[PDB]
Amino acid sequence: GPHMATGQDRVVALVDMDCFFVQVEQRQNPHLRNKPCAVVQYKSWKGGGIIAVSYEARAFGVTRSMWADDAKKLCPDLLLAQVRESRGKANLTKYREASVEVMEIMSRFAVIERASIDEAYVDLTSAVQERLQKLQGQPISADLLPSTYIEGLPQGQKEGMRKQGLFQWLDSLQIDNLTSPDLQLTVGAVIVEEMRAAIERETGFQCSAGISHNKVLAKLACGLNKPNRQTLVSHGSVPQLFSQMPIRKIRSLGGKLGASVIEILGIEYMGELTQFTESQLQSHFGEKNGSWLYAMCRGIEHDPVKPRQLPKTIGCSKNFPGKTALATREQVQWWLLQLAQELEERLTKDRNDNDRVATQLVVSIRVQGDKRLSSLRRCCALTRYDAHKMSHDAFTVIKNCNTSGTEWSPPLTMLFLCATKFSAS
DNA sequence: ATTGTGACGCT
DNA sequence: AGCGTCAC
Ligand SMILES: Nc1ncnc2c1ncn2[C@H]1C[C@H](O)[C@@H](COP(=O)(O)OP(=O)(O)OP(=O)(O)O)O1
Ligand SMILES: [Mn+2]
Ligand SMILES: [Mn+2]
């Protein structure tokens, strides 16, 4: 009823760079622009593993996780850019530094939560109030929303439809009510157009975005119209949108929890969750998950945009699959040193840029025969940014996992070093 | 023989 | 603390 909180208090956007690693390589190498092309890691096994794919290449069926040899079967003219190799492993520095370029621009407009290397949430609530006060009642022109889709419109050529839906939306707006959530979302979308224009002018990178009242809806919205477009998902659009939305498409429901929601309740679509009481959902999925589901299927989520532009952890990982598994102590020591040297480089740079020091070193490994991705995770003190010391300490901490009696058994299929627990410096 | 990350929850 | 889930 009237006391029914509608979860319409905030304006939240999710900005995601289109095929980000590919764009980084296309900026650097103009020969790759506007072409089917992908970014690959390594090159020996089946041509390398594809980790990013241009939209031209996606049209042929090329996807992430595909081997390059197989992608070339689908797309014989596919162009490839290789991830840099340093110290025997893939090194993602070029893409981290490009991400920082973009995040720094986004931070001029509003508070950002770095959600991954290529995407960030934006809390636009205060920016919208400021922009509304600056407007003082004038209507919002379609010209201010040149790449915006209004989800669910029009109702009652793709660009033609986009413009029809946008006109229907803007005609319907009550511009004189500064408290209308729909108006607030629209102004948020204006600001996000400006943000996206700034990113493209100052980096060359294009991105898509979602604008809604919370992070889950903003992330869902972002994927509705890609690439190089943005989508506004209003509170009112939620019943129709969710009525045919597979549960696995909502952030955090793509895994075993979503599968159990489907199996236990006997439903397929997000909207079907509205038929259950909060207590019913809590009984199946726990107190937190149940309350979250009960609100989220109504379009309501309260998870804040956290003020956090930097990663909380700095990690270095390598898999050693099949016959590359490590079977000698020297092999284990040498790779621990390689990882620790990349970690030391990145940490020293982080301490200089961001005025902080890590204090905990996490060491994880995967043993051949383990079906788990991580077999053992142990922590030690990180007291100095010294690669030899970090590697000696990781060895000291994992050494009792060798069940042999110079050899290493069972052979190691993964090494992982992660610097955590940062404190101001 | 998806790899290399990175955030967060549970107990 | 160590392990598990989820998504890029
Ligand atoms: N499994 C992975 N392994 C390594 N890198 C990955 C993996 N998944 C995603 N990435 C990298 C490459 C991507 O360019 C970057 C951003 O991821 P993501 O937003 O999901 O897709 P994308 O930016 O490549 O295309 P788009 O967002 O337009 O669909 O992170
Ligand atoms: Mn992306
Ligand atoms: Mn992304």
Side-chain angles (χ1 to χ4, degrees), chain A residues 42 89 96 306 308 312-313 315 317 319:
Chain A
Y42 306 119
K89 66 180 292 299
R96 292 192 182 98
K306 300 177 180 203
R308 186 201 65 240
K312 313 172 49 103
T313 58
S317 173
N319 289 356

PDB file of all heavy atoms in Angstrom, chain A residues 42 89 96 306 308 312-313 315 317 319, chain B residues 1-10:
ATOM      1  N   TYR A  42      48.268 -17.358 -24.813  1.00  0.00           N
ATOM      2  CA  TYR A  42      49.121 -18.465 -25.227  1.00  0.00           C
ATOM      3  C   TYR A  42      48.844 -18.769 -26.695  1.00  0.00           C
ATOM      4  O   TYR A  42      48.005 -18.106 -27.326  1.00  0.00           O
ATOM      5  CB  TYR A  42      48.903 -19.661 -24.298  1.00  0.00           C
ATOM      6  CG  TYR A  42      49.103 -19.261 -22.848  1.00  0.00           C
ATOM      7  CD1 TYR A  42      48.073 -19.371 -21.928  1.00  0.00           C
ATOM      8  CD2 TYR A  42      50.300 -18.701 -22.424  1.00  0.00           C
ATOM      9  CE1 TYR A  42      48.240 -18.976 -20.600  1.00  0.00           C
ATOM     10  CE2 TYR A  42      50.481 -18.303 -21.106  1.00  0.00           C
ATOM     11  CZ  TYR A  42      49.446 -18.446 -20.200  1.00  0.00           C
ATOM     12  OH  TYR A  42      49.632 -18.036 -18.891  1.00  0.00           O
ATOM     13  N   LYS A  89      54.257 -16.258 -18.191  1.00  0.00           N
ATOM     14  CA  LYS A  89      52.817 -16.302 -17.976  1.00  0.00           C
ATOM     15  C   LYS A  89      52.168 -15.099 -18.640  1.00  0.00           C
ATOM     16  O   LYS A  89      52.828 -14.103 -18.941  1.00  0.00           O
ATOM     17  CB  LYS A  89      52.481 -16.332 -16.483  1.00  0.00           C
ATOM     18  CG  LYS A  89      52.868 -15.057 -15.751  1.00  0.00           C
ATOM     19  CD  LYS A  89      52.532 -15.111 -14.259  1.00  0.00           C
ATOM     20  CE  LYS A  89      51.047 -15.111 -14.009  1.00  0.00           C
ATOM     21  NZ  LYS A  89      50.439 -13.856 -14.554  1.00  0.00           N
ATOM     22  N   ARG A  96      44.757  -3.618 -17.405  1.00  0.00           N
ATOM     23  CA  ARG A  96      44.582  -2.907 -16.134  1.00  0.00           C
ATOM     24  C   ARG A  96      44.812  -1.399 -16.272  1.00  0.00           C
ATOM     25  O   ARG A  96      44.046  -0.588 -15.723  1.00  0.00           O
ATOM     26  CB  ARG A  96      45.509  -3.498 -15.074  1.00  0.00           C
ATOM     27  CG  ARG A  96      45.149  -4.897 -14.667  1.00  0.00           C
ATOM     28  CD  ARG A  96      45.903  -5.330 -13.412  1.00  0.00           C
ATOM     29  NE  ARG A  96      45.562  -6.712 -13.096  1.00  0.00           N
ATOM     30  CZ  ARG A  96      46.291  -7.772 -13.411  1.00  0.00           C
ATOM     31  NH1 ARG A  96      47.487  -7.652 -13.960  1.00  0.00           N
ATOM     32  NH2 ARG A  96      45.798  -8.985 -13.175  1.00  0.00           N
ATOM     33  N   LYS A 306      29.382   0.789  -3.620  1.00  0.00           N
ATOM     34  CA  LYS A 306      30.449   1.024  -2.635  1.00  0.00           C
ATOM     35  C   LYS A 306      31.465   1.994  -3.225  1.00  0.00           C
ATOM     36  O   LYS A 306      31.831   1.856  -4.387  1.00  0.00           O
ATOM     37  CB  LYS A 306      31.091  -0.300  -2.231  1.00  0.00           C
ATOM     38  CG  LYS A 306      30.139  -1.310  -1.611  1.00  0.00           C
ATOM     39  CD  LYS A 306      30.806  -2.621  -1.293  1.00  0.00           C
ATOM     40  CE  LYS A 306      29.871  -3.630  -0.665  1.00  0.00           C
ATOM     41  NZ  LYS A 306      30.615  -4.651   0.110  1.00  0.00           N
ATOM     42  N   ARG A 308      34.574   2.560  -4.105  1.00  0.00           N
ATOM     43  CA  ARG A 308      35.799   1.764  -4.177  1.00  0.00           C
ATOM     44  C   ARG A 308      36.197   1.681  -5.642  1.00  0.00           C
ATOM     45  O   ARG A 308      35.569   0.955  -6.413  1.00  0.00           O
ATOM     46  CB  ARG A 308      35.591   0.386  -3.553  1.00  0.00           C
ATOM     47  CG  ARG A 308      36.851  -0.466  -3.446  1.00  0.00           C
ATOM     48  CD  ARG A 308      36.592  -1.989  -3.300  1.00  0.00           C
ATOM     49  NE  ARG A 308      35.955  -2.594  -4.470  1.00  0.00           N
ATOM     50  CZ  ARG A 308      34.780  -3.212  -4.473  1.00  0.00           C
ATOM     51  NH1 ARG A 308      34.068  -3.355  -3.362  1.00  0.00           N
ATOM     52  NH2 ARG A 308      34.319  -3.718  -5.615  1.00  0.00           N
ATOM     53  N   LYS A 312      40.738  -4.607  -4.230  1.00  0.00           N
ATOM     54  CA  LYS A 312      41.067  -4.919  -2.837  1.00  0.00           C
ATOM     55  C   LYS A 312      42.168  -5.958  -2.711  1.00  0.00           C
ATOM     56  O   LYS A 312      42.660  -6.203  -1.604  1.00  0.00           O
ATOM     57  CB  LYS A 312      39.830  -5.474  -2.110  1.00  0.00           C
ATOM     58  CG  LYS A 312      38.561  -4.682  -2.320  1.00  0.00           C
ATOM     59  CD  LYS A 312      37.323  -5.386  -1.743  1.00  0.00           C
ATOM     60  CE  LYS A 312      37.514  -5.873  -0.327  1.00  0.00           C
ATOM     61  NZ  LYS A 312      36.822  -4.937   0.610  1.00  0.00           N
ATOM     62  N   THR A 313      42.499  -6.632  -3.801  1.00  0.00           N
ATOM     63  CA  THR A 313      43.483  -7.703  -3.785  1.00  0.00           C
ATOM     64  C   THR A 313      44.289  -7.559  -5.057  1.00  0.00           C
ATOM     65  O   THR A 313      43.814  -6.988  -6.046  1.00  0.00           O
ATOM     66  CB  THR A 313      42.844  -9.116  -3.705  1.00  0.00           C
ATOM     67  OG1 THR A 313      41.946  -9.318  -4.807  1.00  0.00           O
ATOM     68  CG2 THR A 313      42.124  -9.345  -2.389  1.00  0.00           C
ATOM     69  N   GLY A 315      46.486 -10.155  -7.331  1.00  0.00           N
ATOM     70  CA  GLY A 315      46.725 -11.580  -7.442  1.00  0.00           C
ATOM     71  C   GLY A 315      47.460 -11.956  -8.713  1.00  0.00           C
ATOM     72  O   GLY A 315      47.366 -11.271  -9.731  1.00  0.00           O
ATOM     73  N   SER A 317      48.281 -15.676 -10.835  1.00  0.00           N
ATOM     74  CA  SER A 317      47.835 -17.065 -10.900  1.00  0.00           C
ATOM     75  C   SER A 317      48.336 -17.735 -12.171  1.00  0.00           C
ATOM     76  O   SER A 317      48.374 -17.110 -13.234  1.00  0.00           O
ATOM     77  CB  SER A 317      46.291 -17.120 -10.861  1.00  0.00           C
ATOM     78  OG  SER A 317      45.779 -18.422 -11.078  1.00  0.00           O
ATOM     79  N   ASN A 319      47.826 -21.738 -14.148  1.00  0.00           N
ATOM     80  CA  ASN A 319      47.481 -23.145 -14.308  1.00  0.00           C
ATOM     81  C   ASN A 319      48.592 -23.919 -15.003  1.00  0.00           C
ATOM     82  O   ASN A 319      49.246 -23.418 -15.921  1.00  0.00           O
ATOM     83  CB  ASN A 319      46.215 -23.291 -15.142  1.00  0.00           C
ATOM     84  CG  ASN A 319      44.990 -22.850 -14.409  1.00  0.00           C
ATOM     85  OD1 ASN A 319      45.042 -22.491 -13.233  1.00  0.00           O
ATOM     86  ND2 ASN A 319      43.859 -22.882 -15.097  1.00  0.00           N
TER      87      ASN A 319
ATOM     88  P    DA B   1      43.191 -31.712 -17.890  1.00  0.00           P
ATOM     89  OP1  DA B   1      41.904 -31.858 -17.164  1.00  0.00           O
ATOM     90  OP2  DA B   1      43.823 -32.876 -18.556  1.00  0.00           O
ATOM     91  O5'  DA B   1      43.018 -30.579 -19.006  1.00  0.00           O
ATOM     92  C5'  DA B   1      42.498 -29.301 -18.652  1.00  0.00           C
ATOM     93  C4'  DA B   1      42.337 -28.415 -19.879  1.00  0.00           C
ATOM     94  O4'  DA B   1      43.639 -27.995 -20.358  1.00  0.00           O
ATOM     95  C3'  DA B   1      41.647 -29.073 -21.071  1.00  0.00           C
ATOM     96  O3'  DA B   1      40.900 -28.102 -21.793  1.00  0.00           O
ATOM     97  C2'  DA B   1      42.819 -29.589 -21.895  1.00  0.00           C
ATOM     98  C1'  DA B   1      43.855 -28.493 -21.665  1.00  0.00           C
ATOM     99  N9   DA B   1      45.234 -28.969 -21.771  1.00  0.00           N
ATOM    100  C8   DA B   1      45.677 -30.259 -21.628  1.00  0.00           C
ATOM    101  N7   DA B   1      46.974 -30.395 -21.792  1.00  0.00           N
ATOM    102  C5   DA B   1      47.409 -29.109 -22.062  1.00  0.00           C
ATOM    103  C6   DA B   1      48.682 -28.579 -22.334  1.00  0.00           C
ATOM    104  N6   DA B   1      49.794 -29.320 -22.370  1.00  0.00           N
ATOM    105  N1   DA B   1      48.769 -27.249 -22.560  1.00  0.00           N
ATOM    106  C2   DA B   1      47.653 -26.508 -22.519  1.00  0.00           C
ATOM    107  N3   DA B   1      46.399 -26.893 -22.279  1.00  0.00           N
ATOM    108  C4   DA B   1      46.346 -28.219 -22.056  1.00  0.00           C
ATOM    109  P    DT B   2      39.367 -27.792 -21.406  1.00  0.00           P
ATOM    110  OP1  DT B   2      38.838 -28.900 -20.576  1.00  0.00           O
ATOM    111  OP2  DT B   2      38.681 -27.410 -22.661  1.00  0.00           O
ATOM    112  O5'  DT B   2      39.462 -26.509 -20.465  1.00  0.00           O
ATOM    113  C5'  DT B   2      38.589 -25.417 -20.668  1.00  0.00           C
ATOM    114  C4'  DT B   2      39.377 -24.165 -20.985  1.00  0.00           C
ATOM    115  O4'  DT B   2      38.456 -23.079 -21.271  1.00  0.00           O
ATOM    116  C3'  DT B   2      40.268 -23.658 -19.851  1.00  0.00           C
ATOM    117  O3'  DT B   2      41.583 -24.245 -19.947  1.00  0.00           O
ATOM    118  C2'  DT B   2      40.293 -22.161 -20.119  1.00  0.00           C
ATOM    119  C1'  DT B   2      38.854 -21.915 -20.568  1.00  0.00           C
ATOM    120  P    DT B   3      42.611 -24.155 -18.710  1.00  0.00           P
ATOM    121  OP1  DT B   3      43.817 -24.945 -19.042  1.00  0.00           O
ATOM    122  OP2  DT B   3      41.853 -24.422 -17.467  1.00  0.00           O
ATOM    123  O5'  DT B   3      43.030 -22.613 -18.658  1.00  0.00           O
ATOM    124  C5'  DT B   3      43.866 -22.039 -19.685  1.00  0.00           C
ATOM    125  C4'  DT B   3      44.199 -20.617 -19.298  1.00  0.00           C
ATOM    126  O4'  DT B   3      43.010 -19.794 -19.337  1.00  0.00           O
ATOM    127  C3'  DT B   3      44.774 -20.439 -17.897  1.00  0.00           C
ATOM    128  O3'  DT B   3      45.707 -19.375 -17.968  1.00  0.00           O
ATOM    129  C2'  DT B   3      43.577 -19.971 -17.093  1.00  0.00           C
ATOM    130  C1'  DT B   3      42.889 -19.088 -18.111  1.00  0.00           C
ATOM    131  N1   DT B   3      41.457 -18.889 -17.865  1.00  0.00           N
ATOM    132  C2   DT B   3      40.935 -17.631 -18.053  1.00  0.00           C
ATOM    133  O2   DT B   3      41.609 -16.676 -18.404  1.00  0.00           O
ATOM    134  N3   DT B   3      39.590 -17.534 -17.817  1.00  0.00           N
ATOM    135  C4   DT B   3      38.737 -18.544 -17.418  1.00  0.00           C
ATOM    136  O4   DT B   3      37.545 -18.301 -17.244  1.00  0.00           O
ATOM    137  C5   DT B   3      39.352 -19.838 -17.246  1.00  0.00           C
ATOM    138  C7   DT B   3      38.495 -20.991 -16.818  1.00  0.00           C
ATOM    139  C6   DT B   3      40.667 -19.949 -17.477  1.00  0.00           C
ATOM    140  P    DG B   4      46.535 -18.940 -16.686  1.00  0.00           P
ATOM    141  OP1  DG B   4      47.916 -18.714 -17.165  1.00  0.00           O
ATOM    142  OP2  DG B   4      46.325 -19.888 -15.566  1.00  0.00           O
ATOM    143  O5'  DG B   4      45.867 -17.566 -16.259  1.00  0.00           O
ATOM    144  C5'  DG B   4      46.046 -16.410 -17.054  1.00  0.00           C
ATOM    145  C4'  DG B   4      45.384 -15.239 -16.391  1.00  0.00           C
ATOM    146  O4'  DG B   4      43.952 -15.479 -16.317  1.00  0.00           O
ATOM    147  C3'  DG B   4      45.834 -15.006 -14.954  1.00  0.00           C
ATOM    148  O3'  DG B   4      45.862 -13.629 -14.694  1.00  0.00           O
ATOM    149  C2'  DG B   4      44.735 -15.686 -14.146  1.00  0.00           C
ATOM    150  C1'  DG B   4      43.537 -15.308 -14.991  1.00  0.00           C
ATOM    151  N9   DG B   4      42.363 -16.115 -14.745  1.00  0.00           N
ATOM    152  C8   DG B   4      42.311 -17.427 -14.350  1.00  0.00           C
ATOM    153  N7   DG B   4      41.089 -17.869 -14.192  1.00  0.00           N
ATOM    154  C5   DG B   4      40.292 -16.769 -14.498  1.00  0.00           C
ATOM    155  C6   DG B   4      38.877 -16.625 -14.495  1.00  0.00           C
ATOM    156  O6   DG B   4      38.015 -17.468 -14.224  1.00  0.00           O
ATOM    157  N1   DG B   4      38.499 -15.339 -14.859  1.00  0.00           N
ATOM    158  C2   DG B   4      39.366 -14.321 -15.184  1.00  0.00           C
ATOM    159  N2   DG B   4      38.817 -13.142 -15.517  1.00  0.00           N
ATOM    160  N3   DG B   4      40.675 -14.442 -15.185  1.00  0.00           N
ATOM    161  C4   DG B   4      41.064 -15.689 -14.829  1.00  0.00           C
ATOM    162  P    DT B   5      46.700 -13.080 -13.435  1.00  0.00           P
ATOM    163  OP1  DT B   5      46.847 -11.614 -13.630  1.00  0.00           O
ATOM    164  OP2  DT B   5      47.908 -13.904 -13.308  1.00  0.00           O
ATOM    165  O5'  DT B   5      45.765 -13.518 -12.211  1.00  0.00           O
ATOM    166  C5'  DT B   5      45.112 -12.571 -11.451  1.00  0.00           C
ATOM    167  C4'  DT B   5      43.829 -12.069 -12.091  1.00  0.00           C
ATOM    168  O4'  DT B   5      42.969 -13.177 -12.450  1.00  0.00           O
ATOM    169  C3'  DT B   5      43.026 -11.244 -11.109  1.00  0.00           C
ATOM    170  O3'  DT B   5      43.278  -9.903 -11.317  1.00  0.00           O
ATOM    171  C2'  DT B   5      41.557 -11.595 -11.351  1.00  0.00           C
ATOM    172  C1'  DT B   5      41.610 -12.786 -12.285  1.00  0.00           C
ATOM    173  N1   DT B   5      40.796 -13.960 -11.827  1.00  0.00           N
ATOM    174  C2   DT B   5      39.426 -13.871 -11.853  1.00  0.00           C
ATOM    175  O2   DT B   5      38.835 -12.867 -12.195  1.00  0.00           O
ATOM    176  N3   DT B   5      38.766 -15.007 -11.454  1.00  0.00           N
ATOM    177  C4   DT B   5      39.319 -16.199 -11.061  1.00  0.00           C
ATOM    178  O4   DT B   5      38.632 -17.159 -10.734  1.00  0.00           O
ATOM    179  C5   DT B   5      40.773 -16.229 -11.068  1.00  0.00           C
ATOM    180  C7   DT B   5      41.509 -17.469 -10.659  1.00  0.00           C
ATOM    181  C6   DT B   5      41.424 -15.123 -11.443  1.00  0.00           C
ATOM    182  P    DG B   6      43.516  -8.944 -10.059  1.00  0.00           P
ATOM    183  OP1  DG B   6      43.747  -7.576 -10.587  1.00  0.00           O
ATOM    184  OP2  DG B   6      44.453  -9.575  -9.095  1.00  0.00           O
ATOM    185  O5'  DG B   6      42.124  -8.973  -9.260  1.00  0.00           O
ATOM    186  C5'  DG B   6      41.005  -8.353  -9.798  1.00  0.00           C
ATOM    187  C4'  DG B   6      39.768  -8.798  -9.066  1.00  0.00           C
ATOM    188  O4'  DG B   6      39.537 -10.190  -9.323  1.00  0.00           O
ATOM    189  C3'  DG B   6      39.824  -8.683  -7.535  1.00  0.00           C
ATOM    190  O3'  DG B   6      39.029  -7.574  -7.093  1.00  0.00           O
ATOM    191  C2'  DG B   6      39.250 -10.023  -7.042  1.00  0.00           C
ATOM    192  C1'  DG B   6      38.684 -10.621  -8.322  1.00  0.00           C
ATOM    193  N9   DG B   6      38.613 -12.073  -8.301  1.00  0.00           N
ATOM    194  C8   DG B   6      39.642 -12.967  -8.196  1.00  0.00           C
ATOM    195  N7   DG B   6      39.240 -14.209  -8.165  1.00  0.00           N
ATOM    196  C5   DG B   6      37.851 -14.111  -8.230  1.00  0.00           C
ATOM    197  C6   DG B   6      36.864 -15.117  -8.212  1.00  0.00           C
ATOM    198  O6   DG B   6      37.024 -16.333  -8.176  1.00  0.00           O
ATOM    199  N1   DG B   6      35.575 -14.576  -8.303  1.00  0.00           N
ATOM    200  C2   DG B   6      35.287 -13.237  -8.370  1.00  0.00           C
ATOM    201  N2   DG B   6      33.984 -12.891  -8.442  1.00  0.00           N
ATOM    202  N3   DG B   6      36.212 -12.286  -8.375  1.00  0.00           N
ATOM    203  C4   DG B   6      37.461 -12.804  -8.301  1.00  0.00           C
ATOM    204  P    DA B   7      38.777  -7.301  -5.521  1.00  0.00           P
ATOM    205  OP1  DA B   7      38.702  -5.833  -5.344  1.00  0.00           O
ATOM    206  OP2  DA B   7      39.616  -8.131  -4.638  1.00  0.00           O
ATOM    207  O5'  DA B   7      37.279  -7.815  -5.289  1.00  0.00           O
ATOM    208  C5'  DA B   7      36.231  -7.341  -6.138  1.00  0.00           C
ATOM    209  C4'  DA B   7      34.878  -7.779  -5.613  1.00  0.00           C
ATOM    210  O4'  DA B   7      34.672  -9.171  -5.946  1.00  0.00           O
ATOM    211  C3'  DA B   7      34.714  -7.654  -4.092  1.00  0.00           C
ATOM    212  O3'  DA B   7      33.430  -7.129  -3.753  1.00  0.00           O
ATOM    213  C2'  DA B   7      34.868  -9.073  -3.588  1.00  0.00           C
ATOM    214  C1'  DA B   7      34.402  -9.911  -4.775  1.00  0.00           C
ATOM    215  N9   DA B   7      35.141 -11.145  -4.831  1.00  0.00           N
ATOM    216  C8   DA B   7      36.500 -11.274  -4.757  1.00  0.00           C
ATOM    217  N7   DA B   7      36.912 -12.505  -4.786  1.00  0.00           N
ATOM    218  C5   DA B   7      35.744 -13.243  -4.857  1.00  0.00           C
ATOM    219  C6   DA B   7      35.514 -14.611  -4.909  1.00  0.00           C
ATOM    220  N6   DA B   7      36.504 -15.511  -4.890  1.00  0.00           N
ATOM    221  N1   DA B   7      34.229 -15.029  -4.979  1.00  0.00           N
ATOM    222  C2   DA B   7      33.249 -14.118  -4.992  1.00  0.00           C
ATOM    223  N3   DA B   7      33.348 -12.787  -4.950  1.00  0.00           N
ATOM    224  C4   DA B   7      34.638 -12.415  -4.876  1.00  0.00           C
ATOM    225  P    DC B   8      33.076  -6.811  -2.218  1.00  0.00           P
ATOM    226  OP1  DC B   8      32.134  -5.667  -2.256  1.00  0.00           O
ATOM    227  OP2  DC B   8      34.335  -6.722  -1.448  1.00  0.00           O
ATOM    228  O5'  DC B   8      32.318  -8.120  -1.703  1.00  0.00           O
ATOM    229  C5'  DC B   8      31.174  -8.589  -2.397  1.00  0.00           C
ATOM    230  C4'  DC B   8      30.786  -9.961  -1.899  1.00  0.00           C
ATOM    231  O4'  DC B   8      31.812 -10.911  -2.272  1.00  0.00           O
ATOM    232  C3'  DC B   8      30.647 -10.072  -0.370  1.00  0.00           C
ATOM    233  O3'  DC B   8      29.366 -10.563  -0.039  1.00  0.00           O
ATOM    234  C2'  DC B   8      31.741 -11.062   0.026  1.00  0.00           C
ATOM    235  C1'  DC B   8      31.906 -11.853  -1.250  1.00  0.00           C
ATOM    236  N1   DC B   8      33.200 -12.552  -1.334  1.00  0.00           N
ATOM    237  C2   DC B   8      33.199 -13.935  -1.462  1.00  0.00           C
ATOM    238  O2   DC B   8      32.108 -14.516  -1.545  1.00  0.00           O
ATOM    239  N3   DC B   8      34.375 -14.591  -1.515  1.00  0.00           N
ATOM    240  C4   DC B   8      35.528 -13.913  -1.429  1.00  0.00           C
ATOM    241  N4   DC B   8      36.673 -14.613  -1.474  1.00  0.00           N
ATOM    242  C5   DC B   8      35.554 -12.497  -1.279  1.00  0.00           C
ATOM    243  C6   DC B   8      34.375 -11.859  -1.227  1.00  0.00           C
ATOM    244  P    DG B   9      28.886 -10.639   1.499  1.00  0.00           P
ATOM    245  OP1  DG B   9      27.645  -9.852   1.586  1.00  0.00           O
ATOM    246  OP2  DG B   9      30.005 -10.388   2.432  1.00  0.00           O
ATOM    247  O5'  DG B   9      28.473 -12.167   1.674  1.00  0.00           O
ATOM    248  C5'  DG B   9      27.851 -12.857   0.615  1.00  0.00           C
ATOM    249  C4'  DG B   9      27.683 -14.320   0.976  1.00  0.00           C
ATOM    250  O4'  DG B   9      28.920 -15.017   0.714  1.00  0.00           O
ATOM    251  C3'  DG B   9      27.353 -14.591   2.440  1.00  0.00           C
ATOM    252  O3'  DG B   9      26.516 -15.738   2.530  1.00  0.00           O
ATOM    253  C2'  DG B   9      28.726 -14.852   3.051  1.00  0.00           C
ATOM    254  C1'  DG B   9      29.430 -15.569   1.912  1.00  0.00           C
ATOM    255  N9   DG B   9      30.874 -15.377   1.909  1.00  0.00           N
ATOM    256  C8   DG B   9      31.550 -14.179   1.886  1.00  0.00           C
ATOM    257  N7   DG B   9      32.843 -14.316   1.884  1.00  0.00           N
ATOM    258  C5   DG B   9      33.033 -15.691   1.910  1.00  0.00           C
ATOM    259  C6   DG B   9      34.223 -16.444   1.914  1.00  0.00           C
ATOM    260  O6   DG B   9      35.389 -16.031   1.917  1.00  0.00           O
ATOM    261  N1   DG B   9      33.966 -17.808   1.931  1.00  0.00           N
ATOM    262  C2   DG B   9      32.705 -18.381   1.948  1.00  0.00           C
ATOM    263  N2   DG B   9      32.649 -19.719   1.976  1.00  0.00           N
ATOM    264  N3   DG B   9      31.585 -17.688   1.949  1.00  0.00           N
ATOM    265  C4   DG B   9      31.823 -16.352   1.920  1.00  0.00           C
ATOM    266  P    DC B  10      25.887 -16.197   3.941  1.00  0.00           P
ATOM    267  OP1  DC B  10      24.524 -16.695   3.637  1.00  0.00           O
ATOM    268  OP2  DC B  10      26.092 -15.179   4.983  1.00  0.00           O
ATOM    269  O5'  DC B  10      26.784 -17.441   4.363  1.00  0.00           O
ATOM    270  C5'  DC B  10      26.877 -18.557   3.509  1.00  0.00           C
ATOM    271  C4'  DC B  10      27.679 -19.648   4.170  1.00  0.00           C
ATOM    272  O4'  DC B  10      29.090 -19.343   4.088  1.00  0.00           O
ATOM    273  C3'  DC B  10      27.375 -19.854   5.649  1.00  0.00           C
ATOM    274  O3'  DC B  10      27.246 -21.251   5.880  1.00  0.00           O
ATOM    275  C2'  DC B  10      28.589 -19.231   6.370  1.00  0.00           C
ATOM    276  C1'  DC B  10      29.694 -19.479   5.364  1.00  0.00           C
ATOM    277  N1   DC B  10      30.845 -18.507   5.406  1.00  0.00           N
ATOM    278  C2   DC B  10      32.161 -19.004   5.387  1.00  0.00           C
ATOM    279  O2   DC B  10      32.352 -20.226   5.405  1.00  0.00           O
ATOM    280  N3   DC B  10      33.195 -18.124   5.365  1.00  0.00           N
ATOM    281  C4   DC B  10      32.952 -16.814   5.360  1.00  0.00           C
ATOM    282  N4   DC B  10      34.000 -15.983   5.342  1.00  0.00           N
ATOM    283  C5   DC B  10      31.619 -16.290   5.356  1.00  0.00           C
ATOM    284  C6   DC B  10      30.603 -17.167   5.375  1.00  0.00           C
TER     285       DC B  10
END
